[PDB]
């Protein structure tokens, strides 16, 4: 038979054993729900590398028609796809204690919600007298609609700074866990994957960049709730660190779970990265990493690469949070690409 994944009982080892079988030529996997039955061709994502505290995390793609991606570490796995245009994540941690802590973490915002409603946005998956949770299913769009939280945004999240290569250039995206913050691996890896993929989708840019995210902790924490103050302070702290000398031409993100003052989701120095002139830790920003707000790091990385705000509410670079993950602006596409070495004579 074709290999299949039962989404009604999907566990970490389900996802690990399936993805670990994906050879260099890809593999067909059936995504199997009740009568719902999508077949996807899965491949290794060779564009992007990720360590989280030196733990190696691998990405997997479907074809474009599949609208499907995976994340796999030793500790956790993620499947994300779209059904009727809604982002749905299956999240499964390997260790039972961590999986329960994750399931209680995602259930707690619904503690006042009617259970009838809740099963649309958030659902525990159990092992086939107390049940064992092997994964959770989140529909963030439905989640937002059920919890009806106040909207966040990015209104003022950028400050004015300060041939085809034979192989892509490696750009490190060095992410730093703010001192004191509680950060979960499935949520950070999802931001990283989305950030990198929003770039590769533009002008065939994988020929020019292969992003390499790493994550460690920093002693720095924001002195206030003010995002500008925080980024100013964070850039200063990169120049102070001797453990970072020699790496002033990479990209730097301070990361946390919550937002800053005025529901601001992130901040970065505008148009501060260029593959020829990057210097002095200028290509730095901050980013929220919570699951309800996909695409934030992508949005901030776009700014770092020159992309401006746009007036389409389906664009990644809309000034209000939208959930959307793709650059729609031809102006932004050209300048981001230009900053990574691309010219129109190169084609896509």
């Amino acid at each position: 038979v074709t290999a299949s994944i039962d989404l009604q009982s999907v566990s970490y080892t389900d996802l690990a054993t399936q993805l670990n079988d994906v050879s260099d030529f890809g593999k067909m996997i059936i995504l199997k729900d009740n009568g719902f039955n999508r077949q996807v061709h899965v491949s290794m994502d060779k564009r992007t590398k990720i360590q989280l505290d030196n733990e190696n995390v691998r990405l997997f793609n479907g074809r474009d028609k599949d609208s499907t991606s995976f994340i796999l570490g030793d500790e956790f796995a993620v499947l994300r796809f779209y059904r009727n245009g809604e982002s749905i994540s299956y999240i499964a941690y390997k260790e039972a204690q961590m999986m329960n802590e994750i399931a209680e973490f995602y259930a707690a915002p619904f503690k006042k919600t009617r259970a009838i409603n809740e099963k649309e946005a958030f659902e525990c998956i159990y092992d086939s007298a107390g049940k064992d949770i092997v994964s959770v299913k989140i529909n963030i769009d439905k989640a937002k609609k059920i919890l009806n939280l106040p909207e966040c945004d990015y209104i003022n999240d950028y400050i004015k700074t300060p041939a085809v290569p034979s192989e892509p250039k490696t750009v490190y995206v060095i992410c730093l866990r703010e001192n004191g913050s509680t950060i979960y691996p499935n949520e950070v890896s999802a931001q990283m994957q989305d950030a990198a993929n929003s770039v590769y989708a533009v002008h065939g840019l994988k020929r020019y960049v292969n992003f390499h995210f790493v994550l460690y902790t920093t002693e720095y924490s924001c002195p206030s709730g003010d995002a500008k103050e925080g980024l100013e302070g964070f850039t200063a702290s990169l120049k102070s660190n001797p453990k970072a000398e020699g790496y002033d031409d990479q990209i730097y993100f301070l990361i946390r779970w919550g937002t800053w003052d005025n529901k601001i989701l992130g901040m970065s120095w505008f148009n501060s990265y260029n593959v020829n002139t990057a210097s002095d830790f200028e290509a730095s920003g901050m980013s929220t990493t919570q699951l309800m707000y996909p695409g934030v790091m992508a949005h901030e990385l776009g700014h770092i690469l020159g992309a401006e705000h746009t007036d389409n509410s389906k664009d990644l670079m809309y000034a209000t949070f939208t959930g959307y993950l793709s650059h729609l602006s031809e102006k932004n596409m050209d300048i981001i690409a230009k900053n990574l070495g691309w010219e129109a004579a190169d084609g896509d």
Partner: nanobody
Amino acid sequence: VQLQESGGGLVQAGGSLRLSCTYSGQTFSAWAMGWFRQAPGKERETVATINWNGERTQYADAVKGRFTISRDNAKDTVYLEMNSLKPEDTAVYYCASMMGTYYSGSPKNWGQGTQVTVSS
């Protein structure tokens, strides 16, 4: 975001019109722009599309050599200059902002549309 065409109306064959399309919105320069047309009982067709910075253009075969698309990012307006009009150029003419590139993108915000009638 709001788009307004203007400059249409009656014109005799061989004459000339100059449509203008005004963009009320904050990031006119973010988007490629296009002109489209639809005659009664006929499918809509693309007439011309233009770069976000006006430097690159693409024309439908039936209008190449006769129509010129331009944009003024300085005034937030896109233009269609139409010369040597033929009866078959009669249609409602719409402008639109588009997602993606000027060559493979998709119109998203449409104008009211202006009427162009070429007589014989």
